[PDB]
């Protein structure tokens, strides 16, 4: 603060920029999203509020975005943000596709969210998104898995496995004890229940507030139904 | 904003592949036309009014493009309507005479209107003859249409600066009268206006049949 | 405000067109920003026909007509160990002397090779800036380009101008670890063709007897491409692997 | 690059209310009172012209023709209500006029006069508009109708009401003195009776501004010959007719 | 005071006020100077009181009385640098509506236009208003002698007479006695000269003091034209 | 507070948007509107701030059509919504001319949000203070009950209300809905609820609004007075 | 020089002499063979005392015309009266700097105090000249001779009268686009004094 | 008061009783400039100027505290150098233009209006601030000799005799002595002498002081700004010593 | 002092002249899916082909205001001329209405157009790029 918090384009003396860091505390009141990579997959995990009893379930749209047949996206802090950054990213990934005649990879997509993000904290006149994503997927021709983070300021990172939103860092902390980068989960089935796991630390009701995406190599996205996350909760809760 | 000018080259493309009279008088003025309207050869109709009106005392006759006529006096209509309802005064047929003006010469003639312009207004008595290039004319008596010129005759047989309202009148019937006699445009029923100095506008609908 | 006042405060700048930066720029007056820029500026008259202007200024005694490529025949063909290009090097005679070899293939970068048709001064500059975005866009992925993603960057670029005058057929050759050997055919009305075999210039048709299979080694490529120029008709040779193109010359 | 943009003049207070809109609502109730009734037959618009002593009464008008169909009336600052009239002058032609060949009915018309007013809340650049409008108007699918227009852009449609100083008096006396089955003489008669109970100072025809939307009005046409045309319905009453009414 | 963000711009004040409106109204009385304007049966007068108590001044570069037209005339209240401002975009507008309409532009029809140029002022946040109040006369071809006001607030209007100044609730005063008296809204005069006299008369017994030739401005507008008097005109007319 | 509430596009210390909240706090002072899906219709119904008798209550200040299957119920500033029911009007008419078809309910929804989103994000701008309720169906969905508020979110629902008691409001819908309810047992519940909820003492005709889509095709009733005086009887109400 | 456009076959002369400066015209305006106006005035004013005579398109130089006259006003509010150097100036300015869309020539005559009467002629392409009189128009080209032969300096207001009658008359004889009543304007410290002469009058010269 | 707190914090904003405090404060700064004056001669102007003694490193010849505005305009200001500067320029500008436009030296008025306008433009947003000089110009022209002083507001006047500058009270009471003194007129020389004596008297000083002189004269100079010589100035500076 | 509207045609063309449609992935070419005109518009084609009327309505009324601002340069100075392009440019800056496209009034009153009418007035008239954000990032340039 000090009077150095009511700008975007404002120094603090020590090298600090506030209002980034507001976003950031924005973005820490948001749902958590967990990001997995596996051998031979990604797994994307969001939680999500319970339902109330008059809200209608059939339309209501989901945490896990699919921005193109192979790159899907979630995100975590406003929701009416994420709209904007979500339908901007798939009028890249399109336009793209038709000026090169090949789709975009998970890291040129990434860069563009962030440089959309970045362009956003240039002006005194607009307000940043209070958004940080979580992209994954595969890219084209290509079966190594991609796995990125994006944050309000524009800064993207590469990650094994990562947190973002409410109670994130006990789900780091679980992740972290209970993640070897040189011996990752070799099937899908080992993801998934890791990041059900991990999704369990911070989750109260438990399988009804999990919603788990799946992406492997050649373009194949599934969205996990009710029944799969509820048998995978009821076998995580019998093996404990 | 404004015209379009879409469909320009596809237009392209695709093609590679009436008397009107105006007499003043000693208190004002008339404008007389005929009520014959073609599309070709072919009669359209028998009974069409070419007198329009500008503002409850000017009134105008037009000839060449029918839509661009239309257009235009039903554009600077509502201009003036406007400019009096700010100024809370009656219009002046200069006025108008001059929005007529700038804007067809904006357009440098591609607007296709040629009108004689008749009023009466707290200043007199006015009529004048409006170019689609933009050049205007004043005159004591003018002439408009492919029958212009047997009007015309009749107009300098018959004209006079004493001129009653009634001498007048029957001076434009008959010069409509020739033109309806001895052009093929024209023929059917005569339209008068009468415009006199403090006093109403009279609009005289198939004055003769 | 004051910028207003000096925009109205007081003619022979206005005469000498130096009011406008392009103006200032194109003439270096400023500095050198006129050789900073990615996208070329090309001029043009400021008429309502510019097309008809310069067709009617080009189709007309000294020797400053615009240079037009040779017409000789040119071959490129694809199988399993990457892609042979032949070139018939039959070299017009005129009021000069050569210093050494005028070559007719374009070498784009050590990877890419691009043929000369047409006007040779469009094929030529553009394929030095194909060159230039294919190293910035290396650069920027950190990986090699696709012949697909050059291929689609050369014809959005003519189609943008196409009608104004530009007179080009290349066909772009390479060798990525994802798409193979890859040949690509591009001229200046928009059209891009991928292909596997692709003979242009007079004598197609005799060149066009490519005895083709995809199990050809690579002497027997050379020596094919060889023989297909010489019953079109020396001939220049380069066979392009996915570590790059390697000139022969015969 | 902080001169491309300007932080907005209205913005909401904690308790959720937008302190521009109500500071242009205070100062509204702070004018001069105007009032409307609607009839079986026709509406009246009443308003008083305060004023110096020495200014002619007959230069400034405060009810003003927007259609040959459509008046309208104003309480608050009277040059945001000129600005907006010569609006609302021009927008009936450009929209409506030129487009369908007809002038426009009262409430499209009270609509986009709705919508200017409303867009000056939504600015970095302007305060919003400080006065009220009374709108009256007949048409042909809708009869005769009386609106009123808030500094918001909020309007609203009324069998009778006033606005200003007296607003509050004049209501409760137009609440116990309006029927359905009210006359446009027995309605200007109530306006008259509404206003007396308002003006403090002289109370006669030179003071006094009223207009009507009633019969058509061949007179005012300026022309004769087509009987398809329809005369004005928007009648401005003069200071003799008023005082003859007073008298009566 | 304004106490807020009133104290620069033109906003609503808690009361429903606009702040800097009613201070350029307390600017336009910077000068204390007095004007009167009154009308004849073919002829306008108006009449502005002189001061010039520095030695070093040129009187004859000392005026706050303008020529707009051919026919029109201006006095203004107020400093002198915003009166010049305002008089050079009343010259150009009458000049714009002659060349726009074909016919000389009326009195009240510009004082129209500078009072809707006013009232930008008064709704321009980044725009302040002049701190003068205009006088426009002219004689009319449609409505005889014409006398209209305008002020800061954008509100105009017309009068039979008009008194501007410190000292103008007198002036008004013995104005509203004579025509009381007379029982009618102009003078009963058919030379502009007699207008004059009277006028300065009134001016004198209103103000309780004597004027000499070098202390007033006297302006007065005919159907032809629209003339100032000189100094010699000025002591012609006080000799009666 | 005081510090991170005069502007839009700031964020406070905890990350928090001041203004946004105001907007929504806003729509507490609106009447209230509720809405109601049944197996075979929607029920709109929702109840006017009127406070004297000369407003004229037969000729449409909460209840508009946007096209001949999407209607919406408003609650806050009734000039903001007007300026956006313009815009979904035209939104709709340029998605059947470009694709021939009837604009689906969710992505007109989603439009209107976005563009209050948008008008949360410049520092000229303020947020609309106005509360939606769509009712509309489609050939995707059936039909579908929508509401959305300043903040740019957009949320689906079987009951819905909004406006100055939505608490109690939801509570009786929670209370009383069923999935295979009827449209005559929904707009006797939503009579009964706004008559429950009222802070005056007689819910009469003169102070409600009431919209029904339903089926013979689909068909939209915006009731009359004189129909609403019935149903009222009818409930006993 | 558009298709279909009126053009201004006319005879035009204005001349200096002692006492100031006279403007004289014919009045008539023909499209092709026909007469359409045959009593057209075509002296035009810009100013109290500086007025002109136009040539070529008249759309064109009525627009020219009214911009000058606007612009004279403006000078005016400022300056007060304008000399004809300046009208000529803005004329020039107009009539040169769009020579490649509109085809106008102006023959200026002003009075002053300081210059006491002068004559600027402006020909299609925007060139100024000033000279003690000039002629223009179609008709003008056969009076070529007739005026080099009879001008004097410093004639009196008859003379000059009687000098321009009889040119104009000859101009009208023989030029089919030429024809009417003769219209002058005589601008002196005196004032502005109309004239005009009825073709049984000048054509028995 | 002369500060008026919470209004002066920004240009173009009026206070409670109608007053503009920024333009005050220019006004402020103008008056810690160094004396300047002008006097008006029977057909002509006068203009004379008190300046500090500078290091030797200065080129004598091209440092000149008299600006020349156009062949007949004298100009000398007080304030900030680079506004007047500034203003010097726009000056000729605008004199410039108008020869150019209508063949004639630009008459006195018309310039001072031009000028006087430029000015007021700078108190009318907040985005600028008002110029920090006063400025004292005359010349000759068809209509005789005159003399005009320019304020920060943008308000101008016609003087016979003019000051500004620290020493302004001292020199405008000489200025008033000498216009009661000599109701007749005064004559250029005798001018050129009594303006050596004003800024003698209003300078009596930390070490030493120059005087520059400068005029424009229908019968001296042929209606022409110019210097005073050597003669004629080393006989005013004679005169005002004793 | 132009009366029809000059210097009309461009000097010089390139693939980056729109800035505000350019290719991320490319940015020396236009991005054709944003552009939204149908997909097959070269820039070239708009070169040649054009109704010799269209570029005079265009331009006329600035080529008009220019012309009085250089009348009002020459007969009252630079000042006046500096005093319009001010108030315009304040108007025109601070004006931001995203869902409207009508001027305003202070506009109209400004350009003397308050009871004036044209064409313009009357006709003053997608899949991407066409809403809240893409007016926001142009008035801002960001």
Same mark, same amino acid.
């Given at each position: 603060? +000090? ?61 896990? +975005? ?65 958004? +940080? ?34 109670? +994130? ?72 | ?209 | ?250 | ?248 | ?240 | ?237 | ?72 006003? =403006? ?48 020909? =299609? ?5 000033? =000279? ?74 | ?18 007053? %503009? ?10 008056? %810690? ?8 001669? %029977? ?45 010097? %320029? ?153 | ?142």
């Amino acid at each position: 603060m +000090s009077g150095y918090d009511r700008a975007l384009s404002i120094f603090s003396p020590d090298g600090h920029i506030f209002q980034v860091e507001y976003a950031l505390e924005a973005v820490k009141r948001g749902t958590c999203a967990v990001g997995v990579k596996g051998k031979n997959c990604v797994v994307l995990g969001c939680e999500r509020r319970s339902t109330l009893k008059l809200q209608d379930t059939r339309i209501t749209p989901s945490k896990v +975005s699919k921005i193109d047949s192979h790159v899907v996206l979630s995100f975590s802090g406003l929701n009416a943000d994420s709209r904007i950054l979500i339908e901007k990213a798939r009028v890249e990934a399109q336009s793209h596709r038709l000026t090169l005649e090949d789709p975009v990879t998970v890291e040129y997509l990434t860069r563009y969210v962030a440089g959309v993000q970045q362009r956003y904290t240039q002006s005194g006149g607009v307000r940043p998104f209070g958004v +940080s994503t979580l992209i994954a997927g595969f890219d084209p021709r290509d079966d190594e898995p991609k796995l990125y983070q994006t944050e309000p300021s524009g800064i993207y990172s590469s990650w094994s496995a990562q947190t973002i939103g409410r109670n +994130s860092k006990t789900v780091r902390e679980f992740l972290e004890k209970n993640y070897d980068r040189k011996e990752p989960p070799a099937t899908v089935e080992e993801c998934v229940k890791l990041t059900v796991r991990s999704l369990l630390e911070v989750v109260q009701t438990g399988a009804k507030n999990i919603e788990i995406t799946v992406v492997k190599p050649d373009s194949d996205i599934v969205a996990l139904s009710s029944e799969e996350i509820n048998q995978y909760v009821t076998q995580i809760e019998q093996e404990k | 904003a404004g015209l379009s000018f879409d469909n320009y080259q596809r237009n392209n493309f695709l093609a590679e592949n009436t008397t009107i009279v105006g007499v003043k008088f000693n208190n004002g003025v008339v404008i007389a036309a005929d009520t014959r309207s073609t599309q070709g050869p072919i009669v359209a109709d028998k009974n069409c009014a070419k007198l329009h009106r500008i503002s409850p005392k000017i009134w105008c006759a037009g000839a060449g493009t029918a839509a661009d006529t239309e257009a235009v006096t039903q554009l600077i209509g509502s201009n003036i309507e406007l400019h009096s309802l700010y100024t809370s005064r009656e219009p002046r047929v200069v006025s108008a005479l001059q929005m007529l003006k700038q804007h067809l010469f904006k357009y440098q003639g591609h607007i296709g209107a040629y009108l004689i312009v008749a009023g009466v207004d707290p200043t007199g008595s006015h009529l004048f003859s409006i170019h689609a290039h933009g050049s205007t004319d004043v005159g004591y008596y003018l002439s408009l249409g492919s029958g212009s010129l047997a009007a015309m005759a009749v107009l300098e047989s018959h004209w006079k600066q004493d001129l009653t309202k009634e001498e007048a009148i029957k001076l434009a019937s008959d010069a409509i009268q020739a033109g309806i006699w001895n052009d093929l445009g024209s023929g059917s029923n005569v339209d008068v206006c009468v415009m006199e100095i403090g006093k109403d506008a009279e609009y005289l609908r198939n004055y003769l049949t | 405000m004051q910028a207003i006042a000096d925009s109205f405060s007081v003619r022979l700048v206005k005469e000498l067109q130096y009011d406008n930066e392009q103006n200032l720029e194109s003439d270096f007056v400023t500095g050198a920003s006129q050789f900073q820029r990615l996208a070329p500026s090309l001029t043009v008259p400021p008429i309502a026909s510019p097309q008809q202007f310069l067709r009617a200024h080009t189709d007309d005694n000294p020797d400053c007509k615009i240079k037009i490529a040779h017409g000789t025949t040119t071959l490129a063909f694809r199988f399993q160990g990457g892609i042979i290009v032949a070139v018939d090097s039959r070299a017009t005679a005129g009021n000069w002397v050569a210093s050494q070899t005028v070559k007719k293939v374009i070498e784009i970068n050590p990877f890419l090779l691009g043929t000369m048709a047409g006007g040779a001064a469009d094929c030529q500059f553009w394929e030095t800036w194909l060159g230039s975005q294919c190293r910035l866009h290396e650069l920027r992925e950190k990986e090699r380009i696709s012949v697909a993603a050059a291929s689609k960057i050369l014809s959005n670029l003519v189609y943008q101008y196409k009608g104004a005058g530009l007179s080009m057929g290349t066909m772009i050759c390479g060798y990525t670890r994802k798409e193979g050997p890859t040949i690509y055919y591009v001229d200046s009305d928009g059209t891009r063709l991928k292909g596997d075999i692709f003979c242009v210039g007079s004598g197609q048709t005799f060149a066009y007897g490519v005895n083709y299979k995809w199990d050809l080694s690579v002497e027997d490529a050379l020596y094919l491409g060889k023989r297909s120029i010489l019953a079109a008709a020396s001939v220049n040779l380069y066979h392009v692997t996915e570590d790059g193109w390697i000139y022969h010359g015969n | 690059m902080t001169d491309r943009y300007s932080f907005s003049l209205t913005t909401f207070s904690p308790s959720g209310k937008l302190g521009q809109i109500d500071y242009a609502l205070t100062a509204v109730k702070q004018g001069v009172t105007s009032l409307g009734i609607k009839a079986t037959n026709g509406v009246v618009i009443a308003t008083e012209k305060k004023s110096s002593p020495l200014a002619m009464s007959e230069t400034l008008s405060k009810v003003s023709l927007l259609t040959p169909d459509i008046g309208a009336v104003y309480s608050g600052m009277g040059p945001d209500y000129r600005v907006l009239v010569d609006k609302s002058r021009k927008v009936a032609h450009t929209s409506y006029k030129r487009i369908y060949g007809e002038y426009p009915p009262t409430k499209l018309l009270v609509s986009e006069v709705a919508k200017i007013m409303q867009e000056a809340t939504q600015s970095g650049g302007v305060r919003p508009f400080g006065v009220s409008l009374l709108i009256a108007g007949h048409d042909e699918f809708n009869g005769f109708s009386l609106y009123q227009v808030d500094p918001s852009g909020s309007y609203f449609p009324w069998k009778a009401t006033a606005i200003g100083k007296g607003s509050v008096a004049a209501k409760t006396f137009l609440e116990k003195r309006w029927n359905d089955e009210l006359e446009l003489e027995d309605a200007i008669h109530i306006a008259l009776l509404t206003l007396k109970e308002s003006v403090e100072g002289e109370f006669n025809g030179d003071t006094i501004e009223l207009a009507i939307i009633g019969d058509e009005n061949p007179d005012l046409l300026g022309y004769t010959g087509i009987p398809t045309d329809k005369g004005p319905r928007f009648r401005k009453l003069t200071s003799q007719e008023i005082n003859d009414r007073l008298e009566a | 005071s304004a106490a807020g963000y009133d104290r620069h711009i033109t906003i609503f004040s808690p009361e429903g006020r606009l702040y800097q409106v009613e201070y350029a109204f307390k600017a336009t009385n910077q000068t204390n100077i007095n004007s009167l304007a009154v009308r004849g049966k073919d002829c306008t007068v108006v009449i502005s009181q002189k001061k010039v108590p520095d030695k070093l001044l040129d009187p004859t570069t000392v005026s706050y009385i303008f020529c707009i037209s051919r026919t029109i005339g201006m006095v203004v209240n107020g400093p002198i640098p915003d009166a010049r401002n305002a008089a050079l975009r009343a010259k150009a507008e009458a000049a714009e509506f002659r060349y726009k309409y074909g016919y000389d532009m009326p009195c009240d029809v510009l004082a129209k236009r500078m009072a809707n140029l006013s009232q930008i002022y008064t709704q321009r946040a980044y725009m302040r208003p002049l701190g003068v109040i205009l006088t426009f006369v002219s004689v009319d071809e449609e409505l005889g002698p014409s006398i209209y006001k305008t002020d800061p607030a954008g509100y105009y209007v017309g009068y039979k007479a008009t008194a501007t100044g410190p000292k103008q609730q007198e002036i008004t005063t013995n104005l509203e006695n004579h025509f009381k008296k007379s029982k009618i809204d102009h003078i009963n005069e058919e030379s502009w000269e007699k207008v004059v006299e009277f006028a300065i008369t009134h001016m004198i017994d209103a103000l309780g003091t004597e004027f000499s030739k070098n202390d007033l401005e006297v302006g007065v507008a005919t159907k032809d034209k629209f003339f100032t008097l000189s100094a010699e005109n000025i002591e012609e007319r006080l000799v009666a | 507070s005081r510090r991170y509430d005069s502007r839009t596009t700031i964020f406070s210390p905890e990350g928090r948007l001041y203004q946004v909240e105001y907007a929504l706090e806003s729509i507490s002072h609106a009447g209230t509107a509720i809405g109601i899906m049944a197996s075979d219709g929607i029920v709109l119904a929702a109840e006017r701030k009127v406070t004297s008798t000369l407003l004229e209550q037969d000729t449409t200040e909460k209840l508009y059509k946007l096209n001949d299957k999407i209607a919406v119920a408003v609650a806050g500033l009734t000039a903001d919504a007007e300026i956006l029911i313009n815009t979904a009007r035209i939104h709709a008419q340029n998605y059947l001319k470009t694709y021939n078809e009837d604009i689906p309910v969710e992505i007109l929804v989603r439009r209107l949000s976005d563009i209050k989103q948008g008008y949360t994000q410049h520092g000229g701008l303020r947020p609309f203070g106005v509360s939606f309720i769509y009712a509309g169906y489609d050939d995707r969905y059936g039909y579908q009950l929508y509401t959305s508020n300043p903040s740019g979110n957009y949320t689906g629902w079987k009951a819905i209300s909004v406006g100055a008691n939505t608490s109690a409001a939801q509570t009786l819908l929670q209370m009383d809905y069923k999935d295979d309810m009827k449209v005559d047992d929904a707009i006797e519940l939503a009579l009964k609820t706004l008559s429950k909820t009222t802070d005056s003492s007689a819910l009469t005709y003169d102070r409600l609004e009431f919209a029904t889509i339903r089926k013979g095709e689909v068909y939209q009733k915006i009731f009359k007075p004189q129909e609403i005086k019935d149903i009222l009887v009818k409930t006993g109400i | 020089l558009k298709k279909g456009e009126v053009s201004l076959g006319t005879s035009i002369m204005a001349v200096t002499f002692k006492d100031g400066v006279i403007l004289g015209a014919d009045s008539r305006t023909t499209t092709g063979a026909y007469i359409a106006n045959r009593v057209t005035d075509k002296l035009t004013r810009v100013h109290d005392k500086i007025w002109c005579c136009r040539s070529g398109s008249a759309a064109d130089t009525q627009a020219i015309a009214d911009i000058v006259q606007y612009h004279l006003e =403006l000078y005016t509010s400022q300056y007060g009266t304008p000399s004809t150097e300046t009208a000529a100036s803005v004329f020039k300015e107009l009539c040169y700097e769009n020579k490649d869309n509109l085809t106008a020539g102006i023959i200026v005559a002003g009075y002053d105090d300081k210059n006491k009467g002068e004559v600027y002629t402006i020909p =299609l392409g925007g060139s100024v000249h000033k =000279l003690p009189y000039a002629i223009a128009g179609s008709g003008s080209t056969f009076i070529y001779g007739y005026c080099d032969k009879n001008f004097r300096e410093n004639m009196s207001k008859e003379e000059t009268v009687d000098f321009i009658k009889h040119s104009l008359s000859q101009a009208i004889k023989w030029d089919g686009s030429s024809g009417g009543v003769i219209r002058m304007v005589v601008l002196t410290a005196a004032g502005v004094e109309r004239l005009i002469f009825y073709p049984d009058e000048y054509e028995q010269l | 008061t002369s500060i008026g707190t919470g209004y002066d914090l920004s240009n173009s904003v009026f206070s409670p009783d109608g007053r %503009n405090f920024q333009v005050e404060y220019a006004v402020k700064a103008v008056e %810690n400039g160094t004396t300047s004056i002008g006097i008006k001669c %029977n057909d002509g102007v006068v203009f004379a100027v008190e300046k500090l003694i500078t290091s030797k490193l200065l080129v004598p010849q091209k440092n000149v505290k008299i600006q020349v505005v156009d062949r007949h305009i004298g100009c000398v200001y007080s304030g900030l150098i680079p506004d007047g500067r500034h203003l010097v %320029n726009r000056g000729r500008e605008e004199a410039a233009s108008f020869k150019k436009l209508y063949k004639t030296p630009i008459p006195i008025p018309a310039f001072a209006d031009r000028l006087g306008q430029y000015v007021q433009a700078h108190t009318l947003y907040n985005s600028v601030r008002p110029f920090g000089v006063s400025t004292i110009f005359g010349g000759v022209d068809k209509n005789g000799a005159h003399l005009y002083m320019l304020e920060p507001s943008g308000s101008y006047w016609g003087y016979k005799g003019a000051a500004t500058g620290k020493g302004r009270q001292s020199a405008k009471a000489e200025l008033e002595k000498l216009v009661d003194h000599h109701p007749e007129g005064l004559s250029a020389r005798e001018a050129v002498k009594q303006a050596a004596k004003i800024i003698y008297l209003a300078h009596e000083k930390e070490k030493d002081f120059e005087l520059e002189i400068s005029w424009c004269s229908l019968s001296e100079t042929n209606g022409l700004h110019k210097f005073v010589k050597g003669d004629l100035l080393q006989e005013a500076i004679d005169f005002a010593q004793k | 002092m132009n009366i029809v509207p000059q210097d009309t045609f461009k000097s010089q063309v390139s693939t980056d002249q729109d800035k505000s449609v350019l290719s991320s992935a490319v940015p020396s070419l236009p991005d054709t899916l944003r552009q939204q005109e149908g997909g097959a518009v070269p820039l070239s084609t708009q070169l040649n082909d054009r109704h010799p009327l269209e570029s005079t309505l265009k331009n006329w009324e600035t080529t008009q205001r220019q012309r009085q601002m250089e009348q009002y340069r020459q007969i009252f100075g630079i000042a006046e001329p500096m005093k319009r392009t001010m108030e315009m440019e304040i108007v025109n800056r601070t004006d931001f209405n995203p869902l409207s496209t009508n001027g305003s009034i202070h506009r109209d009153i400004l350009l003397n157009k308050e009871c004036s009418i044209d064409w313009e007035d009357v006709y003053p008239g997608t899949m991407v790029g066409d809403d809240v954000h893409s007016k926001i990032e142009k008035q801002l340039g960001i």
